[PDB]
Design a protein around this ligand. Structure first.
Ligand code: MET
Ligand SMILES: [Cl-]
Ligand SMILES: [Co+2]
Ligand SMILES: [Co+2]
Ligand code: NA
Length: 282
């Protein structure tokens, strides 16, 4: 299997005018990074809607992953599901991003752009979908096997899913946020994998990325304590090889320098009065 290189994009996909756009669409930048981390009950309930829709789009696009399918096609499918459900694809026009989801194959860590790239037998394909509806965002991602995937890569996918779920299970009010990355890194190390450091989870709500950072490695110097009504993502990227990476000239696609493959899963979470709720649930 060759290393990937950039392909070419299809034209911007339309969205019905009556689906509300985020404030940033049609601007070079968004207004974000200073929003309260704790959401109102109003916003939380709206985030359940957005999260369900994003989860559905993810699942629909996932079902389409097969050898010979292009990553643009996956984007068409995600896009159409969002629009059929009255949601806007948050990534479309975000910081100029040209598509409605991110599609990251093999050595791509994250933020791949859907394009002419053809899925080859044996690939692993992350699809990352964010829905904006009712003035709020819901963000989820999963890595899917395409055709006859090697056991090594099947296990990498399955263990990254399980790392993510284990971390989710530790979310609790009154507990340090740092527990999340402790758990992920412990589980990744169990199976000799390496957790990506420079890319993190994030607070999300009325804005796509607020100032809250969720580390996916063990960093106990973080003092933040989880509180009820906080909303954020857990989205670890887990590598078979070294952490070193490059960013392509598109400014988005992040790739391992050694070209070994890497998997990711993501949910949007709520800290409740006593525990957690996965908002991006089918
Ligand atoms: C083009 S922005 C993609 C952002 C991504 N969905 C995230 O989880 O942050
Ligand atoms: Cl890193
Ligand atoms: Co995402
Ligand atoms: Co995210
Ligand atoms: Na990857």
């Amino acid at each position: 299997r060759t290393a990937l290189s950039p392909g070419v994009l299809s034209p911007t996909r339309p969205v019905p005018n009556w689906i509300a756009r985020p404030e940033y669409v049609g601007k070079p930048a968004a207004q974000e990074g200073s929003e309260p981390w704790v959401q109102t009950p109003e916003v939380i309930e709206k985030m359940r809607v957005a999260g369900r829709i994003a989860a559905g789009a993810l699942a629909e696009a996932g079902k389409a992953v097969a050898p010979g399918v292009t990553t643009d096609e996956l984007d068409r499918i995600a896009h159409e599901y969002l629009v059929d459900n009255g949601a806007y694809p948050s990534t479309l026009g975000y910081k100029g991003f040209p598509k409605s989801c991110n599609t990251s194959l093999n050595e791509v860590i994250c933020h791949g752009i859907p394009d002419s790239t053809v899925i080859t037998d044996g690939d692993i394909v992350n699809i990352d979908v964010t829905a904006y509806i009712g003035g709020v965002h819901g963000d989820t991602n999963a890595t899917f096997p395409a055709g006859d995937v090697a056991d090594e890569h099947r296990l990498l996918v399955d263990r990254t899913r399980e790392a993510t779920m284990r971390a989710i299970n530790t979310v609790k009010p009154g507990r340090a946020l740092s527990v999340i990355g402790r758990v992920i890194e412990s589980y990744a190390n169990r199976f000799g994998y390496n957790v990506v450091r420079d890319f993190t989870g994030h607070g999300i709500g009325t804005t796509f990325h607020n100032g809250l950072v969720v580390l996916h490695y063990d960093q106990p110097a973080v003092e933040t304590i989880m509180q009820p009504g906080m909303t954020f993502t857990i989205e670890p990227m887990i590598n078979l090889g070294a952490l070193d990476y490059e960013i392509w000239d598109d400014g988005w696609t992040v790739v391992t320098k050694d070209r070994k493959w890497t998997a990711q899963f993501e949910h949007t979470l709520l800290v409740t009065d006593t525990g957690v709720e996965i908002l991006t649930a089918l």
